[PDB]
Write an enzyme that holds these catalytic residues in place. Structure first.
Site, PDB file in Angstrom:
ATOM      1  N   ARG A   9     -17.756 -34.417  68.195  1.00 48.63           N
ATOM      2  CA  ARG A   9     -16.991 -34.841  69.360  1.00 48.63           C
ATOM      3  C   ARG A   9     -17.810 -35.882  70.112  1.00 48.63           C
ATOM      4  O   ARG A   9     -18.919 -35.589  70.573  1.00 48.63           O
ATOM      5  CB  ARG A   9     -16.661 -33.648  70.255  1.00 48.63           C
ATOM      6  CG  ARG A   9     -15.745 -33.997  71.410  1.00 48.63           C
ATOM      7  CD  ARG A   9     -14.408 -34.499  70.899  1.00 48.63           C
ATOM      8  NE  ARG A   9     -13.756 -33.521  70.037  1.00 48.63           N
ATOM      9  CZ  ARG A   9     -12.588 -33.716  69.442  1.00 48.63           C
ATOM     10  NH1 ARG A   9     -11.943 -34.863  69.609  1.00 48.63           N
ATOM     11  NH2 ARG A   9     -12.066 -32.771  68.675  1.00 48.63           N
ATOM     12  N   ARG A  10     -17.240 -37.081  70.268  1.00 49.81           N
ATOM     13  CA  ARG A  10     -17.986 -38.234  70.768  1.00 49.81           C
ATOM     14  C   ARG A  10     -18.738 -37.919  72.054  1.00 49.81           C
ATOM     15  O   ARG A  10     -19.978 -37.895  72.076  1.00 49.81           O
ATOM     16  CB  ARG A  10     -17.017 -39.399  70.989  1.00 49.81           C
ATOM     17  CG  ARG A  10     -17.668 -40.695  71.443  1.00 49.81           C
ATOM     18  CD  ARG A  10     -18.193 -41.485  70.257  1.00 49.81           C
ATOM     19  NE  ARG A  10     -17.203 -41.575  69.185  1.00 49.81           N
ATOM     20  CZ  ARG A  10     -16.206 -42.454  69.154  1.00 49.81           C
ATOM     21  NH1 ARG A  10     -16.057 -43.330  70.139  1.00 49.81           N
ATOM     22  NH2 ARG A  10     -15.356 -42.457  68.135  1.00 49.81           N
ATOM     23  N   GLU A  39     -17.615 -49.816  58.679  1.00 52.13           N
ATOM     24  CA  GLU A  39     -17.503 -51.256  58.477  1.00 52.13           C
ATOM     25  C   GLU A  39     -16.056 -51.746  58.470  1.00 52.13           C
ATOM     26  O   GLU A  39     -15.153 -51.046  58.943  1.00 52.13           O
ATOM     27  CB  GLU A  39     -18.229 -51.652  57.188  1.00 52.13           C
ATOM     28  CG  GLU A  39     -19.732 -51.368  57.260  1.00 52.13           C
ATOM     29  CD  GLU A  39     -20.547 -52.173  56.261  1.00 52.13           C
ATOM     30  OE1 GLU A  39     -20.556 -51.813  55.063  1.00 52.13           O
ATOM     31  OE2 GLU A  39     -21.164 -53.180  56.671  1.00 52.13           O
ATOM     32  N   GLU A  82     -10.850 -34.851  60.143  1.00 53.58           N
ATOM     33  CA  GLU A  82     -12.024 -34.802  59.285  1.00 53.58           C
ATOM     34  C   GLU A  82     -12.291 -33.389  58.785  1.00 53.58           C
ATOM     35  O   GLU A  82     -12.643 -33.198  57.615  1.00 53.58           O
ATOM     36  CB  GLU A  82     -13.230 -35.356  60.035  1.00 53.58           C
ATOM     37  CG  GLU A  82     -13.115 -36.835  60.332  1.00 53.58           C
ATOM     38  CD  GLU A  82     -14.113 -37.295  61.367  1.00 53.58           C
ATOM     39  OE1 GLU A  82     -14.835 -36.439  61.917  1.00 53.58           O
ATOM     40  OE2 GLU A  82     -14.177 -38.513  61.633  1.00 53.58           O
TER      41      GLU A  82
END
Length: 140
Positions: A9-10, A39, A82
């Protein structure tokens, strides 16, 4: 393809995720985290393929890391996506507990409750090297 995909979690786990990346790379592992190795291309495709290609799936359970996963039945949260992708690909899930309190499994979406059945590694601020060695022992 990398050996370790770090999901987190950011707001609450970005720092510890980077710390895990640095340590695991010091022990010879190739670690993918979006803040660095993400990327060009559609980030959805690239995130999903990085989860699918990584042998190990490290999940940083920071305080409240799964709050946005709850009742996300459209599967729109990225940590939820995810975790579901890692479960689907039969990945080696290695949760990292960092001041995280496990909620009831039945409050999380059905497609990710299985993450609570995996043995985790409690992050020790006093013995970080021991935690990293335990994580290494969990990795394959």
């Amino acid at each position: 393809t990398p050996d370790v995909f770090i999901s987190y979690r950011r707001n609450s786990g970005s720092q510890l995720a980077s710390l895990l990346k640095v340590h695991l790379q010091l022990h010879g592992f190739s670690v993918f985290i979006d803040v660095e190795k993400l990327e060009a291309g559609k980030f959805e495709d690239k995130l999903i393929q990085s989860v699918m290609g990584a042998r190990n799936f490290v999940l940083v359970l920071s305080p409240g890391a799964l709050d946005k996963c709850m009742q996300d039945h459209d599967c729109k949260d990225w940590v939820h996506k995810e975790i579901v992708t890692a479960l689907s690909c039969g990945k080696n899930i290695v949760p990292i507990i960092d001041g995280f309190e496990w909620p009831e499994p039945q409050v999380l979406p059905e497609d990710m409750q299985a993450v609570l059945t995996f043995n985790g590694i409690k992050w020790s601020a006093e013995y970080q090297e021991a935690t990293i060695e335990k994580i290494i022992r969990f990795l394959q």
